[PDB]
Structure 1
Amino acid sequence: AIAFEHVTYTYQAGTPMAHTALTDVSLTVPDRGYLAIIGHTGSGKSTLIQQLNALLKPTSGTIKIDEFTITPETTNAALKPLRQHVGMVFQFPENQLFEETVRQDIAFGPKNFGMADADALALADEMLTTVGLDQSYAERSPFELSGGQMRRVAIAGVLAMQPKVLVLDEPTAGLDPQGRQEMMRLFARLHQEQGLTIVLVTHQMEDVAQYAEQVAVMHEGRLMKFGTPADVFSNREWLQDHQLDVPQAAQFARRLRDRGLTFPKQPLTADQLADYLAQQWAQR
C-alpha cells in the first residue's frame, strides 16, 4: 500500500523564488490497487508521481510504501531499494534506451541492483515476450527499432526490475489506437493477474473509468477529490470547474436521461451502460 500523510513539496525551498507544486496531500491506495491521477497540466500530479519513486523527498509530511517510509529527513542512499520496488515508466520512455543490444538495456535495470549479468540477461530474455516482442529482437540494436517497439523495450526494461508498484505518466501518448490498446491491456492484465499496483497519470477519462478503482483529482497543486471513479465522476460541473469532464458514456447516458430513461447508477463506460439497457430491454 501507498499512503501520503500531509505530503507537501516546494521547489527551491528556503528560497524567495521557492514554488510549492504540491500541498497537503493525503491519500491511501490499497494493495493490488489502481490509482489514476488526473487534473490540468502542471497541477503537480507529476511532482506527486516523482514522490513515489523517491526522485523528490517530501518537504513536509510523510509517505509510506510497504516496507518503506519517506520523510523530509530520509537520506537518499537508504532509498535505493525503493527505485526497484516502485517502477516508473516516464512519458515517451523511448529516449532512455542506450545499450548495444536491446537485451543488455533490459538487463541494465536488474544489474544496477546487483544481479550478475548471467541471470539478468536471462531475465531480459523472458521480459521481451511479456512486453510483446520476439526473441530476434534480443540481439538487435535499440535504434534499429521502430518508435513503437522502442517503447516496448523501454517498458520491458522497467518490468525487469520486478517492481511491486508500477507508475506510468503517459503509457499511451503518441501511439496509434491499437498500440494504445495492446498496452492498456498489458497493464490491466498485470494488475488483474500477478497482482501489481498501477499508478496512472492520464488525460483520457475513458482509460480511467474503465480501468481504475481509485481516482485523484489534482488541481493547482492540491488534492481536490479522491475516491472511486463512481464518486469522482458523478458530479460534472465540479469537474468542468477543474478543467476536466466525465467520460463519454456518461454524457450520452445524460442524453438518454433527458429522454426519460433512468439508471440505478451513473454509467461510466459503454459496457456498464449496455448492462443497464440490456436489463431494461428484457423488461421492455
Structure 2
Amino acid sequence: AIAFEHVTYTHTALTDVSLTVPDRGYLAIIGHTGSGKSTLIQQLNALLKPTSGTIKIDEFTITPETTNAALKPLRQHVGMVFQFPENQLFEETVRQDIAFGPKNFGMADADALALADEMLTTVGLDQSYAERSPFELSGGQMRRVAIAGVLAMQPKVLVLDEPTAGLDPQGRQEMMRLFARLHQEQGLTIVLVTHQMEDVAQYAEQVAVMHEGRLMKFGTPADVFSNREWLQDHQLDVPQAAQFARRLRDRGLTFPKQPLTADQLADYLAQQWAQRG
C-alpha cells in the first residue's frame, strides 16, 4: 500500500526516488552499517517532513505542503517498535500499561481493558501475568509485553527495528516466528531494519539497500544478493549459504541460480547428486 514517484525529500541532497510496495508484504531495509538511520524512516513520519512532491500511504496521501495536523491519523495507522522497548513500561499493572495507547487515542476504558486480554493472549502469555507489576517480570517477558502494547492499536503497517538484540538464539527464533505468524494470519505489512542476513534471507519478500541515505537498489532478494562485489562497497555482506555456494561453484560446479538460504542449496545439491547416482 506504498507508492512513490521521484518526489521524496532532497543537509546533503537525498535524490528523489520512485518505488512501490504491495500489500501484505515484507520490506527489509539492510541499511548503512555505521548507523541504522531511524531518521530516514522518520523522513515522512513523526517530526521530520518530506518535500519535493506527494507521498501516498493507503487512504492518507501526504501532499508536499501537508503540515503536522494531518500526521495525527498517520500515528493511528503505522506502528513502530523502538530498539529495547523495555524502557517504556511505567504503569502499575500489565493490563493498564497495555491499554495506555488506545485509551490515549480515545476508546471506552472497559473496551480497552477487554482488548488487553486478547492482545496478551496473542503474544503467548498467561492471564495471571496481568496482575503483576512490569518491573518484577522476566527479561524477554517485558519486551513481549511492550510488543503487545504497541500491537494493541490494531494497525496495518508495522515498523520493527533490531527486534532480536540482546537475546539468545531461542528467543530470536520465537520472536521472528511470532512476527511471521502475525504476518501470515492477521494480514499486516511489516517493514524490517536489521543486521543479521539470515532473517532477511528467509522471512522477506522485498529488500532495500541504503547507504548514507540513498536508495540505490530495490526488488526481490534474489536479484539484490547476486552482485557480491557491489555490496562489499558499503560494508555489507551476503548469507553464509552464498559463501558456500560461491566456494562450490569456483571448485567447478554450476547452478541455474544463486542459492540464498541453506535449504535451496541443499535441494540443488540433492537433486544434482541424485541425478549422478
User: Following the alignment from structure 1 to structure 2, what is the Cα–Cα distance between the partners of residues 4 and 51?
Assistant: 13
Q: In the alignment, is the contact (CA less than 8 A) between 1:8 and 1:58 conserved in 2?
A: yes
Identical pairs, percent: 100
TM-superposed deviation, 1:267: 0.7
TM-superposed deviation, 1:163: 0.9
Unaligned ranges ≥5, structure 2: none
- 1:84-132 Cα offsets, whole Å, 9 max, x none, are 2111111111111111111111111112222111111111111112112
The alignment's TM-score, normalised by the length of structure 2, stands at 0.93
TM-superposed deviation, 1:30: 0.5
Q: In the alignment, is the contact (CA less than 8 A) between 2:36 and 2:193 conserved in 1?
A: no
TM-superposed deviation, 1:43: 6.0
- 1:20-77 Cα offsets, whole Å, 9 max, x none, are 4854243211101100001224667422322454443213333211001223421222
- In structure 2, the CA distance between the partners of 1:48 and 1:3, relative to structure 1 (3 Å rule), is farther
User: Following the alignment from structure 2 to structure 1, what is the Cα–Cα distance between the partners of residues 130 and 37?
Assistant: 35
1:220 paired with 2:201, answer: no
- In structure 2, the CA distance between the partners of 1:7 and 1:195, relative to structure 1 (3 Å rule), is same
- In structure 2, the CA distance between the partners of 1:36 and 1:7, relative to structure 1 (3 Å rule), is farther
TM-superposed deviation, 1:280: 1.5
TM-superposed deviation, 1:6: 3.2
**Paired residue for 1:194?**
186
Secondary structure at 1:203 match in 2: coil
Equivalence map 1:1-284=2 (5 Å): 1-9=1-9, 19-20=11-12, 22-41=14-33, 45-51=37-43, 53-284=45-276
Secondary structure at 2:4 match in 1: strand
**Paired residue for 1:14?**
none
Q: In the alignment, is the contact (CA less than 8 A) between 1:57 and 1:71 conserved in 2?
A: no
TM-superposed deviation, 1:245: 0.9
TM-superposed deviation, 1:8: 4.1
- In structure 2, the CA distance between the partners of 1:127 and 1:22, relative to structure 1 (3 Å rule), is farther
- In structure 2, the CA distance between the partners of 1:43 and 1:25, relative to structure 1 (3 Å rule), is farther
Q: In the alignment, is the contact (CA less than 8 A) between 2:4 and 2:56 conserved in 1?
A: yes
- In structure 2, the CA distance between the partners of 1:22 and 1:211, relative to structure 1 (3 Å rule), is farther
The alignment's TM-score, normalised by the length of structure 1, stands at 0.91
Q: In the alignment, is the contact (CA less than 8 A) between 1:86 and 1:164 conserved in 2?
A: yes
TM-superposed deviation, 1:151: 0.6
Unaligned ranges ≥5, structure 1: 11-18
Structure 1 stretch displaced more, 262-271 or 229-238: 262-271
- In structure 2, the CA distance between the partners of 1:185 and 1:22, relative to structure 1 (3 Å rule), is farther
C-alpha RMSD of the superposition: 1.9
- 1:160-208 Cα offsets, whole Å, 9 max, x none, are 1001001101111111111111011111111122221010001111111
TM-superposed deviation, 1:264: 1.6
TM-superposed deviation, 1:141: 1.2
TM-superposed deviation, 1:5: 3.4
More strand by share: 1
Q: In the alignment, is the contact (CA less than 8 A) between 2:198 and 2:239 conserved in 1?
A: yes
- In structure 2, the CA distance between the partners of 1:48 and 1:26, relative to structure 1 (3 Å rule), is farther
Structure 1 stretch displaced more, 214-223 or 187-196: 187-196
